[PDB]
Every structure is written in structure tokens, then in C-alpha cells.
Amino acid sequence: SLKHSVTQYLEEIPQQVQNRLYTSPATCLAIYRILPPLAKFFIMAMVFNENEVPLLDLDKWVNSNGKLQFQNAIKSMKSLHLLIPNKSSGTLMINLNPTFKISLRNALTGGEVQNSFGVVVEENVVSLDLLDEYSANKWETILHFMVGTPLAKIPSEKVLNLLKHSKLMEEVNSTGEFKITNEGFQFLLQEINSQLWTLLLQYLKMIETMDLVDVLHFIFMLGALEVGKAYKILSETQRIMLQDMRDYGLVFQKHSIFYPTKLALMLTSDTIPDGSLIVETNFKIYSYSNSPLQIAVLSLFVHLKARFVNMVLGQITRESIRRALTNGITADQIIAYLETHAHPQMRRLAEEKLEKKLELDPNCKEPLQVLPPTVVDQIRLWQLELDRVITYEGSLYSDFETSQEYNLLSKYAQDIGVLLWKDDKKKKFFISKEGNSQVLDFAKR
């Protein structure tokens, strides 16, 4: 999703801002890697040629089969203003952005880069001992607060405010606490790379007047830096934002010099299993997860009963699923988490059942199911219980002198999509509270 979500954010950026962004070669290289593979082919060809190339020739470059990919590639390039079209003498010529072209060329070859990539100090630090531990602790702490489980350490105020403003992990002052919404659980399910960009993108939106271009340049530059190998401390806005990243764990400072963190390398791009669990027809759960986070996240919708060093065992109960649904989690997410973390034994047994079913009747094909059907059905049914009775807020209109007026009002309410119930025999109809003002205004006129 990063290959698309990050692209969408860049497209929304104004053209003038995008042109400024292309100044730094490091950002250009990152923006080069996010484009579709076919876009990479065309862009690289145009980097080393300082001349206009007609669009027809680029079309000829592609085969008949891959016409659809070409259409997507050109649209993506045009969206980001990478390709500037020019119409003259009845010819449609396309050229690369001079700022992007020069910066990208400088990155590939040896040339002035205005120290965009930073400067090496030749002071390496063991990663498996300190940087990795520091990165895990910071990510472990922030995630623990998100899940809601108690933890003595508290995330910094700046990150706490961002989460409060952020849609995920909604906080209610009246309740006096912070709770996980549907988006919050989705964030937990998403991998580390998706989670990191999820927070980073929100921070970029929140920041107003720290220049946006400066922040984006540092973030893209951060990916270029490799684990360890501190670099000398760069705009003033970058320095303060660097401190913010340090609170997030993306960067480690000894107090002078900042060591890039492993998460920074993961930020560049992608790259029995831990966290897997077994679900029985008896509704028991046994998770082979020793990580403290895995136990906490499971406890959100599972009634934990005991734990060993090797694994944690619990059971799904009406209380556990009811609690999760009340928080805001959907039953679809609950099954998704259980299935993705299925134990290999469950997968092997499910495959055997599928093979036997196919042998009995290969004509009919059904999807492979890892979890037992009964457990999934019970969880879905429990969700249906919450929506057993539906309540709407609105007003009821009746006692109409003429049937024509009632019909016109009912038709108008339905058109604007605010009619909840109607009955011609009684000449009554109930509308939603949101549309009450609109209906009243229409009645007056």
C-alpha cells in the first residue's frame, strides 16, 4: 500500500511545491523508486538525453500486450508533473522536468549534491546492542500506549497530541480515557513499514508553518542513510523535526551526533513464525508469542487465562468479543487477525480437508479456511447481537390536511436521503434529525 499511498500524497502536493521538492537529489531518487516499473524505464532513458522526445516514440517503445501499463505509467508521470508536455507544429513533445532531471543525474554520477546525503564521521556503533534495542523500546512503548494496556513509561507530549488529533485511537474526555477505534486496530494489523508511514504521514499533515518542503526532504533523506555511521548535525526546522523523529525512535542522538536507526532503513522500502496461535473448536486460544506486545494486543478481544514463557493460552468468550465490538472493532478484523496468524498445524489440517473435499467432488471449488467454521460463525453472530435493535434520532411528521402535501414531503425527504420510515395509510413519515432542518425549510416554502 506504501507504493500507492505515498504516491497519492505526493500527487496532492501543489505543482510549485513539487518543483521545489525535486531540488534535492536524494528526494528525487526516492520519488524515482515509487513510480511504476514502466515509468522507471522511460524516465531513465530521458535522464541522459537533453532533447525533446515525441510521445508517439514512447508508445512505440511498448509492445501491444503492455498497452494498459503504458497508460498507467504516463498518467502517473503527468500527475506528479514529472513529464512536461509541449504542443508545437502539430507535434506533442514530452520532456523531463529540468530540476528533477539535473538532480537525478547528480545522484547517479559523481557531482555536487550540496551534502544532501550528509557527511560521514567514521564512528560506528553496534546495532544489535543499542540502536536495535533503542528502536524496539521506542516503538514498543508507543504501540503499548496505542493498545491501551497499562505501561509506566508514557509517550512524549508531541506524539500524544498527534494521536489525539489523529483519527485512530480516539480519546474521549467525558470517559476520561483513550480507546482504540476501528482505524487503531487497522494500524496494529498493518506491518511495521505501513505503520511507520501511517504515523509519518499524519505528522506531515499536522505540521503547519517548520516548512513542509524541509520536513519532506529530511524524511526522504533519512531513508538514504544506512544503519549506524553517525552524520554531523541542516536547516533549523530540520533540527527541531529531527528531535521529533528521535522521540519516535527513527533517529538516535547520543545527546551532537545522531545515529540513523534501523527503522529509518525500513522506511526506505519493503525489506514456527512468532505470533502464531492455534484456535480450537472449543474456543480456546494458544499463542506462541513471547513478545509483550503480542500478549497485549491479543488481550484486547481475548480473555487471557494463564501464560508460560513459551506461549500464552486463553479463550474467546462473549465478554471478550463484546468488549472489542463496543470499542469500535469490527468482526471482520477479528477473524482477519486470527487467520493471518494461524499456526502451521491449522494450515496443514485445513489443506488436508480441502484435498479430501476436492477428491470427493472436484467439480465444486471452495476457498481454503484455516480457522474452524464454528468459531468464525459465533464471532459474526455476536456482532449481529449488538445491532439487534437499531435506534434513529429524528422527528415524526403527521396530521397533514391534504394527501398531496404529505406525498410531496415524503418524496422530497427520500430524494435528499433523510427519510427513515413512511406510511401512506396513516399519512405519517419519520425523518432523520440531520434532515429535519431541510424538510422544515422545504415545508415553509
Binding site: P373, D377, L384
Partner: peptide, 9 residues
């Protein structure tokens, strides 16, 4: 698994 289908009757 039949859940969303109309109840028998």
C-alpha cells in the same frame, strides 16, 4: 455458513 440469509419461516 448461513448468517446473513433471511431467517426461515
Amino acid at each position: 455458513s448461513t448468517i446473513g440469509k433471511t431467517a426461515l419461516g
